[PDB]
């Protein structure tokens, strides 16, 4: 029931995650019995879950015609975006309870975005604004407590945190902008194009992010983990 | 599909949680880099989640005609009641493995209560009794191992624990009593009145509890958090 | 909607879990002030959750006629199989981050198995293969990382781990074999017989496992817990 372009977009996301899974799985094998192996392993789980959920959408299991609702992508994001933040929190050396609070905010952001996607205007816009409020709090925490914590660590660990922090922030800001421009609000981006855009940003946000992270020198990953 | 009285009750709950969010949000900001900030932060998250779920019920998103089933309140409780017990566990100095067991019992209590609410008599009463059994186990834990652990701490931390322990017990006992008197069992309390009562108890159990906790002297919260 | 044999199988599983919960619950209460009490408590929670889900299937709550899908057993397994792996990880002395990774693989195994159960052939077989891939990763970790960590512990703790590791592995391999032979796939085993078989293996994998673990000498459980 979806457009041909939407199906192409789902295939792009799926193949991207599968390639990521091979890359990070191999890196994790290469890092067995080494400090810092948690980083390729987390990257591997992120792309494995995203890849599985892309497959459920290809198969029509987590999409629903009402326009097609691609609700599987929220099942993906509600699991993978916390693990991405966990990555930065470990790099930053952030206290576990603070990491937990940001993960709670993130899950709230994704679930209110799901409600926004399922609703009709203008109620959908209310939930979009609520979810953006949670996003802004997450961005503020990244730019403040994460950054202050990372600045107390070794220079190379701090440098890697800042690179990934900035990469994550730029990519994540793309999502609510695409949402607002797409069929859920202003209807500027056609539904099929929207699926393709999300797949490209997903690949950047998960495979690109993991490539930057896991390509750091092994000594840096070792000291970052402890 | 709900009565006007029920809608009034949902708005009371919603506005109460929003006011609580302002209070605990300001307290969390004020304790930004102080030991004990975890307490206003958890209180903020509790009323944020409860307020969002009250909003989903106002909007008819988590309410289903089957006779109006307010199943959104279980999505609220299954998340917020564990965090309330975590609060008491940190104050008591309780070992995390013991906190985990009581949280598991609490999630079991809420989920069996959801099955009781969705079921028809007499099967609904079976699940009510099972959920009550989990509740009695939680109460016994609060009165025994939580209380013995708190009694090892200094006088002011122990006194704060006991105040919040007693407050929590009295308010939580109200819930299964309202449930038994309302539409799901004896049908003594009309559905609309039941919604109003839950909103008032919810405000007391989340905002009132958080106010007692977050108004303690900051040095006590700092000591309790260690 | 379900056969008489299938209902008999559900009652066998339910009664087995109730028996386990009495045994492990009383053992947990008897160990209330001792090191190692986490083992009977986790065993109690495992059979409590499984028994409750068996009850939901007896009552038709987590069973849907499609020709009958027993989807409640996935709600059971997604919670209990992680706790069983946690048991082995505590006995082995495994690093918590490693336990978290195998638990993630296990949840993925159970959820992809649920998708396989809900799907139609040949798509169901794709998810079965994916789930088997996760299962193989779990078995590999049990036979490598868990085993290496246990061998660095006291001979009595290590001997207990190996006995439970071998017991668990043999029993868990039975599940995907039954699945492929049964009603969710190739229909060699009648549906009613398949329910009875799952009840028997479930009792062995939860009550039998818990009996072996909690019957160890209390000093062995004590040093394993630390
Ligand atoms: C791997 C997937 C990633 C990094 C997805 C990130 C998604 C977001 C940051 C979503 C943001 C949203 C809002 C801030 C408002 C409501 C709409 C959303 C869910 C797209
Ligand atoms: C903020 C919300 C709170 C503190 C809610 C607490 C709810 C309960 C203690 C519910 C208890 C129930 C039983 C013990 C039996 C079954 C019915 C319930 C779920 C109302
Ligand atoms: C107490 C319940 C237990 C120990 C259940 C264990 C279940 C499994 C190991 C399931 C395995 C499966 C596969 C590996 C492939 C797909 C079918 C499953 C879910 C039966
Ligand atoms: C309807 C079938 C459409 C098939 C579309 C093929 C996708 C083309 C591959 C693009 C994968 C990008 C991988 C990026 C790796 C970093
Ligand atoms: C370094 C260890 C970090 C551990 C992070 C714990 C995750 C906390 C997430 C719990 C939040 C539950 C949100 C439920 C829906 C709002
Ligand atoms: C058929 C429409 C094609 C749509 C092209 C979408 C490109 C969107 C890119 C947005 C951000 C790119 C992140 C890449 C960073 C390396
Ligand atoms: C001091 C921090 C304590 C944190 C304990 C978190 C325990 C998490 C609860 C585990 C129980 C899961 C049961 C799920 C049943 C659906
Ligand atoms: C071990 C748990 C004790 C639970 C206390 C039982 C309270 C009585 C509830 C019985 C349900 C009666 C349904 C009312 C029929 C209108
Ligand atoms: C010691 C810390 C954990 C204490 C909580 C134990 C969990 C007890 C749950 C019991 C549920 C029984 C329901 C059946 C009653 C008829
Ligand atoms: C040291 C104990 C002080 C805290 C005591 C709190 C008592 C809570 C009063 C709540 C009033 C609700 C009454 C409902 C009775 C059915
Ligand atoms: C512990 C529960 C306290 C609840 C107090 C509520 C008092 C008002 C309830 C009156 C309901 C009677 C409605 C009359 C119309 C049928
Ligand atoms: C003693 C160590 C306990 C470790 C428990 C951590 C559990 C983390 C589970 C990771 C969640 C992955 C879920 C994927 C699908 C929702
Ligand atoms: C889709 C699942 C991906 C599986 C991970 C692939 C890992 C490849 C291992 C490569 C090891 C090479 C050693 C030199
Ligand atoms: C649609 C009916 C809603 C009326 C309730 C509004 C109450 C007045 C607003 C109070 C503002 C709350 C400040 C935190
Ligand atoms: C109505 C179904 C008959 C009841 C049979 C009872 C099942 C016995 C379970 C065995 C428990 C095993 C504990 C080791
Ligand atoms: C800042 C944006 C808040 C959400 C407003 C959405 C308005 C969409 C207009 C749709 C016209 C087709
Ligand atoms: C028709 C309005 C009914 C008003 C109900 C008042 C509820 C007070 C509950 C107090 C419980 C602590
Ligand atoms: C409309 C209802 C407003 C309730 C706001 C509650 C703030 C104080 C809570 C005290 C709990 C006893
Ligand atoms: C521990 C709970 C007691 C068990 C009650 C089982 C009730 C079975 C009812 C079957 C009727 C369809
Ligand atoms: C122990 C951590 C390894 C988890 C690996 C999961 C493997 C999933 C395989 C998917 C089937 C192709
Ligand atoms: C690497 C994944 C291994 C999967 C094992 C295959 C299970 C049997 C497939 C038969 C399905 C019809
Ligand atoms: C929280 C403030 C409530 C203001 C009510 C707005 C009414 C809009 C409904 C059309
Ligand atoms: C009222 C709930 C059941 C109470 C059992 C525990 C009482 C022990 C008091 C120390
Ligand atoms: C941390 C103890 C393990 C409990 C696993 C529960 C998994 C629920 C998945 C839905
Ligand atoms: C009527 C079902 C009886 C099933 C027999 C259970 C015992 C078999 C253990 C191998
Ligand atoms: C770290 C995994 C988070 C999963 C959150 C799921 C909430 C629906
Ligand atoms: C029906 C919900 C109206 C809320 C306004 C939405 C835009 C802020
Ligand atoms: C974590 C803060 C969430 C704020 C949501 C409301 C913003 C309008
Ligand atoms: C985009 C959120 C603004 C937060 C900035 C915090 C101060 C660097
Ligand atoms: C059509 C190919 C898409 C490649 C995505 C690249 C992500 C940075
Ligand atoms: C439409 C009913 C609104 C009720 C407002 C309640 C005041 C807190
Ligand atoms: C229709 C407005 C009635 C609101 C009642 C307010 C009770 C707090
Ligand atoms: C500083 C402690 C933050 C704890 C917040 C967790 C809320 C679930
Ligand atoms: C800081 C005020 C938060 C407002 C609560 C919003 C409830 C969804
Ligand atoms: C800010 C909350 C708006 C709620 C609108 C309710 C419309 C039925
Ligand atoms: C009658 C609708 C039941 C929906 C409840 C689902 C809550 C997880
Ligand atoms: C610690 C709060 C999260 C509990 C959520 C459980 C939902 C089944
Ligand atoms: C002590 C941790 C127990 C958690 C198990 C929860 C299963 C219902
Ligand atoms: C069909 C289930 C009936 C159980 C009723 C038990 C009430 C105590
Ligand atoms: C489309 C029929 C299969 C349904 C599978 C649902 C998986 C979430
Ligand atoms: C259209 C889905 C086909 C899945 C292939 C089955 C692999 C055994
Ligand atoms: C993959 C099967 C290995 C089983 C070996 C365990 C010894 C009983
Ligand atoms: C190699 C020893 C494994 C024996 C366990 C089998 C239990 C059915
Ligand atoms: C080593 C066990 C893998 C599961 C394959 C199931 C056999 C049909
Ligand atoms: C792993 C990609 C499979 C593609 C099938 C056409
Ligand atoms: C491995 C995925 C193949 C599915 C084809 C739709
Ligand atoms: C459109 C139905 C999707 C529900 C997502 C949980
Ligand atoms: C059912 C999910 C509701 C989340 C709103 C915070
Ligand atoms: C769970 C939220 C559903 C909203 C449908 C409009
Ligand atoms: C904090 C509210 C954000 C709204 C911007 C769209
Ligand atoms: C709108 C909420 C923003 C919070 C910033 C700390
Ligand atoms: C089909 C769109 C391809 C865009 C390349 C980044
Ligand atoms: C979602 C079903 C939960 C059952 C609790 C016993
Ligand atoms: C858990 C679902 C219960 C529904 C019974 C009508
Ligand atoms: C209309 C009910 C109001 C209740 C406030 C105590
Ligand atoms: C009607 C407001 C209720 C406040 C909680 C005591
Ligand atoms: C019930 C609210 C109490 C507030 C104490 C500061
Ligand atoms: C007919 C009842 C059989 C029970 C087997 C344990
Ligand atoms: C280090 C692996 C943890 C995986 C988190 C989902
Ligand atoms: C792991 C793929 C399916 C997850 C949603 C049930
Ligand atoms: C299932 C095969 C496991 C391999 C053991 C190293
Ligand atoms: C390896 C487990 C031995 C079997 C115990 C009955
Ligand atoms: C793998 C079993 C196939 C059965 C064909 C009837
Ligand atoms: C009824 C059979 C019990 C199986 C115990 C291993
Ligand atoms: Mg929409
Ligand atoms: Mg009901
Ligand atoms: Mg099937």
Residue numbers in the entry:
A (entry chain C), B (entry chain A), C (entry chain B): 0 to 65, 68 to 227
What does the published report state?
The crystal structures of cell-free-synthesized N2098R and N4075R were determined at 2.65 Å and 1.9 Å resolution, respectively. Since the two structures were almost identical, only the structure of N2098R is described. Next, to further examine the ion-transporting activities of the CyRs, we heterologously expressed three synthesized rhodopsin genes—N2098R (BAY09002.1), B1401R (WP_074382570.1), and N4075R (GAX43141.1)—in Escherichia coli. A light-induced decrease in pH was observed in the suspensions of the cells expressing each of the rhodopsins (solid line), and this decrease was almost completely abolished in the presence of the protonophore carbonyl cyanide m-chlorophenylhydrazone (CCCP) (broken line). These results showed that N2098R and B1401R transport proton from the cytoplasmic side to the extracellular space. On the other hand, N4075R was thought to act as an outward proton pump, but its activity was smaller than that of the others. Therefore, the possibility of transporting other ions cannot be excluded.
